[PDB]
Design a protein around this nucleic acid. Sequence first.
RNA 1: ACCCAUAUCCGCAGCAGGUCUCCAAGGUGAACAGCCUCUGGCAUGUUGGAACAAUGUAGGUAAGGGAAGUCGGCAAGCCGGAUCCGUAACUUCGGGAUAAGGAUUGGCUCUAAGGGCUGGCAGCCGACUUAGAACUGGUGCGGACCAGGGGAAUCCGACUG
RNA 2: UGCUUCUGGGUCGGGGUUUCGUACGUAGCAGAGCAGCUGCUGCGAUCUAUUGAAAGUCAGCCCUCGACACAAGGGUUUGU
Lengths: 24, 60, 61, 394, 131, 107
Amino acid sequence: DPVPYQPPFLCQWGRHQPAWKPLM
Amino acid sequence: SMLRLQKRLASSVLRCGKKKVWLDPNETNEIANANSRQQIRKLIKDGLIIRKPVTVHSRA
Amino acid sequence: MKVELCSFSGYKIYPGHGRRYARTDGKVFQFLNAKCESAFLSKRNPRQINWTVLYRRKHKK
Amino acid sequence: SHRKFSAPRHGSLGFLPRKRSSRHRGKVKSFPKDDPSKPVHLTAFLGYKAGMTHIVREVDRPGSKVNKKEVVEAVTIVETPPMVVVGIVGYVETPRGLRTFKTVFAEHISDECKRRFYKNWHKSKKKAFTKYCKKWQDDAGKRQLDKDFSSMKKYCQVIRVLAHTQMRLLPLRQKKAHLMEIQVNGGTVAEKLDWARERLEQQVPVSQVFGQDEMIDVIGVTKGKGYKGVTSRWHTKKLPRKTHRGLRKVACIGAWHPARVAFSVARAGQKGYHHRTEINKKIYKIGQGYLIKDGKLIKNNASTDYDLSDKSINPLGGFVHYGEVTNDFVMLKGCVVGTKKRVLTLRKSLLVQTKRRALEKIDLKFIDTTSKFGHGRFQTVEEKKAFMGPLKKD
Amino acid sequence: SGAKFRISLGLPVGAVINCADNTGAKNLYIISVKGIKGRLNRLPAAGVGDMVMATVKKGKPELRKKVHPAVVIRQRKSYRRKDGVFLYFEDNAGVIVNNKGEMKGSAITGPVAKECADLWPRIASNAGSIA
Amino acid sequence: NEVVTREYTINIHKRIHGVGFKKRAPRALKEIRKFAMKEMGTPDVRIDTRLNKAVWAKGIRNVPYRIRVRLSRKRNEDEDSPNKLYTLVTYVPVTTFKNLQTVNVDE
RNA sequence: ACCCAUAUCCGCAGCAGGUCUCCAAGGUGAACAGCCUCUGGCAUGUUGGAACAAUGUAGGUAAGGGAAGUCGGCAAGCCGGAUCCGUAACUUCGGGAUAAGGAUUGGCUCUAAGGGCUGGCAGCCGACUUAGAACUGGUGCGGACCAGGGGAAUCCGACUG
RNA sequence: UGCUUCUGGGUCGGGGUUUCGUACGUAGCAGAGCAGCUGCUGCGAUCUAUUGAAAGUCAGCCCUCGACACAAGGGUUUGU
Ligand SMILES: [Mg+2]
Ligand SMILES: [Mg+2]
Ligand SMILES: [Mg+2]
Ligand SMILES: [Mg+2]
Ligand SMILES: [Mg+2]
Ligand SMILES: [Mg+2]
Ligand SMILES: [Mg+2]
Ligand SMILES: [Mg+2]
Ligand SMILES: [Mg+2]
Ligand SMILES: [Mg+2]
Ligand SMILES: [Mg+2]
Ligand SMILES: [Mg+2]
Ligand SMILES: [Mg+2]
Ligand SMILES: [Mg+2]
Ligand SMILES: [Mg+2]
Ligand SMILES: [Mg+2]
């Protein structure tokens, strides 16, 4: 079987994400 | 037992759909050893498999 | 406790039941149930509706 | 910071272990305090919620806007067949409480009461009180019985009597009687015990305990409604339409820093089936059973002085989800607790009842026996037959 | 002596009832009800025979753009009388009436419910029919 | 005393009450099978195909209110089994279900 | 050969995604819309059974009031087809415009008008429409489906893209 | 909560209650009218009578004691 390649991270944190945003 | 080869071949020999193929439920072991189109033409002639009629869609 | 009659049916209303209705022109109406209230407010005729008392006096039943 | 606009709180924390009742039958948590100036009597009775109807009556309270006017009043009917007294029990006053001292049962206890002592009466050999009753047909057992009553004359302070409902008379499915201790409040304890020893294996009807225009306490278990949310169980505000994870919720539980959720915060759970005691229920009418005399029975329960019609309080098609009330009953102003067929403890009032409204006398003008299984519109059967005329099935 | 029993009151703040007298008004916009302590998130509501603060929303221009005290006379929300009848009208209505109870107009069109007319004698004197 | 045939009418309407629209003809079949298990203590209940057509005659939603059913206990044929007897459940066409007692039909 | 796509391709997989064409019935209807059916196909989308708690998710319904809710009419609802009227400010004179606002609508039984071929007439033939009238129903009729909420202004960008 | 005192529940049927609103079939010198034959006969929505009829109604409505079978069982534990 094809060993699954490591989890494909596609960012959400950072400045785009409006959920968990701190102060600033 | 397994009558999908005979229903497919009966559909192709009758020139209809297998919606209309009527394989006899009592003579399952006589249809089950047909396995060709020549044997199935004999089963058509004997009347063990029948083209079912068109479902009525009346225009009346 | 004057038992009153339905303005639509003609049935005899008892002191707990029904719902009394007053228009702006005067003419307070009593009803036995919202069957008769809904039949009245739809401007149906009691003489054309089979189970009412007025139909059954009109058609001699 | 503080809550901006102050508001009262949703729910009462006096009723707060909002669980299913551990009892099906309402316990008298407190009997009335006796004085020996009164004669000996019962202070409680055990009836069954039959159903509901209207009443029409004149009101005589001076000063009101409804003085000498005819109101309608919702009433409950509680079917109360007479209870049978099968035991006495005395209570000694202790510094730890009020301990049950000695229980003395009767000789002949019916199978109705015997059902109660058995979780499965089909499988059993029905052996209860079979060695107890050998005390009642000898000499030595009767001497021990007399010594038990004499030992209760000295030491008992509270005497309660064991009575069960005569369950055979009801329209219910069950055959198993409800037992209940009723505190005998009356004169001295010896007179009380002689009185209750007289009443052993005897019928006690409801007119013995209660009377008309009496305010009683009605004890029972609430109609059960299930596992309900905090908008049903506690009646908080529904959150706006735009809320993500649901809106029939309590949004903020508590603050950060008491880092527990408090007991005063409203959570979801068991709504209904709670034990309640709801007081000041006026007995509008004590009714009478059906009874046969001069061959033909007399059943006119809902007959009043202004009606003079031979109808019983049973509506057309009977009571809905209950059955027929062929026994004597009490008719109580307003609604009482519980579902239909619910055993419903009646208690004489703890309080010294002195008001204008609570001392009012009652003369009814009209007991409504219209059908409650739909919008009924005829009071009795022959009225319907005289109005409708003859049908096809005739 | 005898006081008003509570009945079902289905005219909250925001209702435009019509004006059943000859002041010249046509509408009455209820801006509050007189006598309400209140509770968090409730509209003050008014039934028959409730003194109410209104606003003529159309009518004579001498009457518009100010607050009038008013009395509610007919309501379409059904209310139970103490003899056990549920009564409701063909529309909601009211009259402009000062703070002591005197009618600003002369006559009242339509019936006046008696829950109002027992409690307000000048309206009952101008009332054509009652209930 | 074992092989008994007998007529029943089953009030399907009070056994099908409350169930959703896509589950009325299947539940009607399940309560006919429970009925045949109750009146005759045979766990092997075989219900006829003409009764299947009779229950499904309208659709999966609308099922007939009463149905007349001939309920026949029988001695079991070979394929010998834990069940000594089987109940065959047959359909009886009936114009009206009025004053129909449970008739013990005779063999 | 075969699959040619809610399982044969590409999406780490029998993945609700993606991926170029050809054929194309009956009714209703303007319709290759939606809804029902025939030919052909299928087995409910990687499982079943029992109950019908809360919280959901997706549909609805609500007396009386009617935006008082909210940052904000968000969401929902109103309106909706056809025919007959009627249609404003303003304007680049094209529009605005289905402006706005009204009436009608079913079934049944009739009447009138609208044509061809052969030898101002006579015979023999066939199509769908349109208009009007009577009668009739518990005022119900675009009965499901389909199917514009509208008006008065202000800012910005002419517009279509 | 119920599970043999010929008793007990259950099923079905019958009554009561109630919900909608007057079934099919038949009949009609009732029917806007139309067609055909020398007044009769067909087509026709609707109406009237039969007929407060028809249909549903405990599945969590109320009484039956009318039919019909069933029910004196199976299992696991528990001792001062
Ligand atoms: Mg504060
Ligand atoms: Mg959101
Ligand atoms: Mg009721
Ligand atoms: Mg608020
Ligand atoms: Mg090829
Ligand atoms: Mg798949
Ligand atoms: Mg579809
Ligand atoms: Mg599915
Ligand atoms: Mg499947
Ligand atoms: Mg509303
Ligand atoms: Mg409304
Ligand atoms: Mg606002
Ligand atoms: Mg929107
Ligand atoms: Mg415009
Ligand atoms: Mg400007
Ligand atoms: Mg642009």
